Amino acid sequence: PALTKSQTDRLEVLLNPKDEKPFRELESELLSRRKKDLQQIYAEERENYLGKLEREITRFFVDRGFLEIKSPILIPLEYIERMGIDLSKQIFRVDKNFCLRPMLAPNLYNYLRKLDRALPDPIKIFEIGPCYRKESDGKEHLEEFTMLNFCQMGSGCTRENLESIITDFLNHLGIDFKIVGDTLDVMHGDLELSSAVVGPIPLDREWGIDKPWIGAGFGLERLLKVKHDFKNIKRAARSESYYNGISTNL
Amino acid sequence: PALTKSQTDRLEVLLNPKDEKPFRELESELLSRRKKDLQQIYAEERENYLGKLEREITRFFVDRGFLEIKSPILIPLEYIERMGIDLSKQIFRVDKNFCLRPMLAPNLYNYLRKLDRALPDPIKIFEIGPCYRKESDGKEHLEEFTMLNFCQMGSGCTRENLESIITDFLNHLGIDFKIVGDTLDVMHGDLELSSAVVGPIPLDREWGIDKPWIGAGFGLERLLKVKHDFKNIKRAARSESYYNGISTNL
Ligand SMILES: Nc1ncnc2c1ncn2[C@@H]1O[C@H](COP(=O)(O)OP(=O)(O)OP(=O)(O)O)[C@@H](O)[C@H]1O
Ligand SMILES: Nc1ncnc2c1ncn2[C@@H]1O[C@H](COP(=O)(O)OP(=O)(O)OP(=O)(O)O)[C@@H](O)[C@H]1O
Ligand SMILES: N[C@H](CCCCNC(=O)OC1CCCC1)C(=O)O
Ligand SMILES: N[C@H](CCCCNC(=O)OC1CCCC1)C(=O)O
Ligand SMILES: [Mg+2]
Ligand SMILES: [Mg+2]
Ligand SMILES: [Mg+2]
Ligand SMILES: [Mg+2]
Numbered sequence: 001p002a003l004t005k006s007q008t009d010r011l012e013v014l015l016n017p018k019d020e021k022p023f024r025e026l027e028s029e030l031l032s033r034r035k036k037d038l039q040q041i042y043a044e045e046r047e048n049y050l051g052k053l054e055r056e057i058t059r060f061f062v063d064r065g066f067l068e069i070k071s072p073i074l075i076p077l078e079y080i081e082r083m084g085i086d087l088s089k090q091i092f093r094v095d096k097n098f099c100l101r102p103m104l105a106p107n108l109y110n111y112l113r114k115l116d117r118a119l120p121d122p123i124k125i126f127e128i129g130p131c132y133r134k135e136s137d138g139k140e141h142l143e144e145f146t147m148l149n150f151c152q153m154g155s156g157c158t159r160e161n162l163e164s165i166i167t168d169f170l171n172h173l174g175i176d177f178k179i180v181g182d183t184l185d186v187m188h189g190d191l192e193l194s195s196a197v198v199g200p201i202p203l204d205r206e207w208g209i210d211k212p213w214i215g216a217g218f219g220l221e222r223l224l225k226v227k228h229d230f231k232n233i234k235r236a237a238r239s240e241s242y243y244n245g246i247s248t249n250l
Numbered sequence: 251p252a253l254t255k256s257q258t259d260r261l262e263v264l265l266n267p268k269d270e271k272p273f274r275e276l277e278s279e280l281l282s283r284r285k286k287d288l289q290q291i292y293a294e295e296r297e298n299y300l301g302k303l304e305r306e307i308t309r310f311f312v313d314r315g316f317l318e319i320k321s322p323i324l325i326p327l328e329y330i331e332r333m334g335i336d337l338s339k340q341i342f343r344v345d346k347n348f349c350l351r352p353m354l355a356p357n358l359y360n361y362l363r364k365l366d367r368a369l370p371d372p373i374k375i376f377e378i379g380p381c382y383r384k385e386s387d388g389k390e391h392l393e394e395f396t397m398l399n400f401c402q403m404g405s406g407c408t409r410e411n412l413e414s415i416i417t418d419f420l421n422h423l424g425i426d427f428k429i430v431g432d433t434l435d436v437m438h439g440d441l442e443l444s445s446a447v448v449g450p451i452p453l454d455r456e457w458g459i460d461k462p463w464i465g466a467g468f469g470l471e472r473l474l475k476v477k478h479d480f481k482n483i484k485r486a487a488r489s490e491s492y493y494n495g496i497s498t499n500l
Binding site: 067132 | 295360367
C-alpha cells in the first residue's frame with residue numbers, strides 16, 4: 001500500500017512544480033500529464049527553454065548597447081594559469097594544450113583589449129555559452145552549464161551602474177533577487193545567481209587591460225531553475241532526460 | 251617597393267570580401283576601414299553572425315513544426331561506438347568515459363526514441379550547436395564548429411520531402427546550392443554544405459528506432475562562409491581573431 005522510496009523517486013521524476021497510492025495509477029496519471037505537456041509544446045511554441053532564454057538575454061543586452069560575442073569553448077590551458085587559477089582541480093583538460101573553458105572571462109579579456117583599439121569608450125560586450133567544471137553532486141551545479149558574462153570597460157564603470165544593469169536585467173526576466181556586497185553576489189534566497197565585480201583588479205595587467213570595468217556572470221540553468229521552480233538544476237540542463245523540465249523517460 | 255609575402259599576408263587579414271605599395275599606407279587604409287566596420291556594428295546591430303544565424307535557423311525550423319533540442323555537448327564515448335564509428339581518430343576524448351560530440355546524431359536518436367512515446371506522428375526535431383573533430387589544416391574545416399541537424403520520423407519521410415525542406419531552407423537563407431544524389435549531399439560549388447539521409451538504415455536498430463526517417467546536417471560556419479564570401483572558414487568561426495569576419499587584430 002505505502003509507496004516505496006524507489007516508487008516515490010519514479011513519481012518525482014514525473015512530477016512538475018505546478019502539479020497539485022496505488023503506484024501504478026499515480027504513475028499512469030503523471031505519464032498522461034507529461035505526455036500532454038510535451039504534446040502542447042510540440043503543437044504550439046516548440047522552443048527549448050535554454051535556447052529561448054539565451055535569445056531573450058541576447059536581445060536584452062544587444063538592446064542595451066552590448067556587443068554579442070561568440071568565442072571558442074575549447075581554450076588554451078595557458079588561459080587558466082593566466083587567470084591566476086593555481087577551480088584548478090575542476091578543469092576538463094583536452095589533449096595536451098587545451099581545456100573546456102570553465103568561465104568566459106579569459107576570452108572576454110582578450111576581446112576587451114582588442115576592441116579598445118577600434119570602439120569608442122565605453123566598450124560593452126557580452127557572451128552567452130557553454131562552460132565546463134568538474135563538480136561534486138549537487139542540486140545547484142552542473143558539469144556542463146551555460147554562462148552569461150557581460151562587461152563594460154572605460155567610462156561609467158561604477159558599482160551603481162553595475163547594480164542598475166543587474167536590477168534591470170533580473171526585473172526584465174522576472175527573477176527575484178538580492179545583491180549582497182568591489183565584489184557582489186546576486187542571490188535568490190541561498191542560491192547564487194551571479195558573481196559580479198567592479199574593477200580594476202590586479203589580474204587585468206596580465207591581459208593587457210588598464211581601464212576601469214564592471215562585469216557579472218550568471219548561470220542560465222540557475223536562472224531557469226528559479227524561474228520555473230525546478231527542485232533540481234538537472235531539469236534546466238542540456239539533457240537527454242528532461243525537455244523543458246519534463247521527463248523524457250515516459 | 252614590391253610587397254613581401256608576409257606583408258601581403260598581413261593585408262589579407264585586414265581585407266574584406268567587399269573591398270575593392272607602400273605597405274604602411276595600405277595597412278593604415280585597411281586598419282581604418284576595419285575599425286569603421288566594427289564601429290558600425292557596435293553602433294547599430296551588435297549581433298554576432300554565428301549567434302544570429304543560429305537564431306534565424308531556429309526560427310525557420312520552429313515555424314516549420316520542428317521541436318528545438320538542446321542536448322549535451324559532452325557525450326559518453328559509448329555513443330561513438332554505437333554510431334558504428336570504428337572519424338574514429340578525429341574524436342576529442344575527455345576523461346575516461348566522455349568525448350566532445352563530433353555530430354548531433356546520437357543525442358537526436360535518443361530524442362526520437364523517447365519522443366515517440368509522447369508525440370504524434372510525424373516527429374520533427376532539430377538541434378543547433380557545437381561539434382568537435384580533430385581536422386587537418388584546411389580552409390573548409392574547423393576543429394570547433396556548429397552543426398544544424400534536423401530530422402523527421404514517421405509519415406512523410408520521403409526523399410522528395412527531404413529535398414523540399416533543404417530547398418526551402420537554403421532559399422530562405424539565400425544560399426545557392428545543388429543537391430547531388432537514400433543519401434544526398436548539398437553542395438555549393440565543390441564545398442559540402444550538408445550530408446542528408448533518407449532512412450531507415452541498419453544503424454537505427456542500435457538506437458531503438460524502427461520507423462522511416464529523413465534528416466540532414468549542415469555546418470553553420472560553412473553557411474556563413476558562403477553567404478559572406480569568406481576565403482577561409484576561420485572568419486566564420488568562434489574566434490578571438492575575427493568578429494563577423496573582421497580582424498580583431500587592429
Ligand atoms: N557548476 C555550475 N553549474 C551551474 N551554474 C554554475 C556552475 N558554476 C558556476 N555557475 C554559474 O556561473 C556564475 C558565475 O560563476 P562563478 O565562478 O562566480 O561561480 P561559483 O562562485 O563557482 O558558484 P558556486 O559557489 O555556486 O560554485 C555563478 O553565479 C552561477 O550562476
Ligand atoms: N570540421 C568541420 N568544420 C566545419 N564544418 C563541418 C566540419 N565537419 C563537418 N562539418 C559540417 O557538418 C556537415 C555534416 O557533417 P558530416 O559528418 O556529413 O561532414 P563530412 O562528411 O565529414 O564533411 P567533409 O567531407 O567536408 O569533412 C558537413 O556537410 C559540414 O557542413
Ligand atoms: N569569471 C567568473 C564570473 C565573474 C563575472 C565578473 N567578471 C567579469 O565580468 O570579468 C570581466 C570579463 C572579462 C574581464 C572583465 C568568476 O570567476 O566569478
Ligand atoms: N551525422 C552527420 C550528419 C548527417 C545528417 C543526416 N542524418 C540524420 O539526420 O540522422 C538523424 C538524426 C538522428 C538519427 C536520424 C553525418 O555523419 O553525416
Ligand atoms: Mg563553484
Ligand atoms: Mg561566484
Ligand atoms: Mg569530415
Ligand atoms: Mg558528409
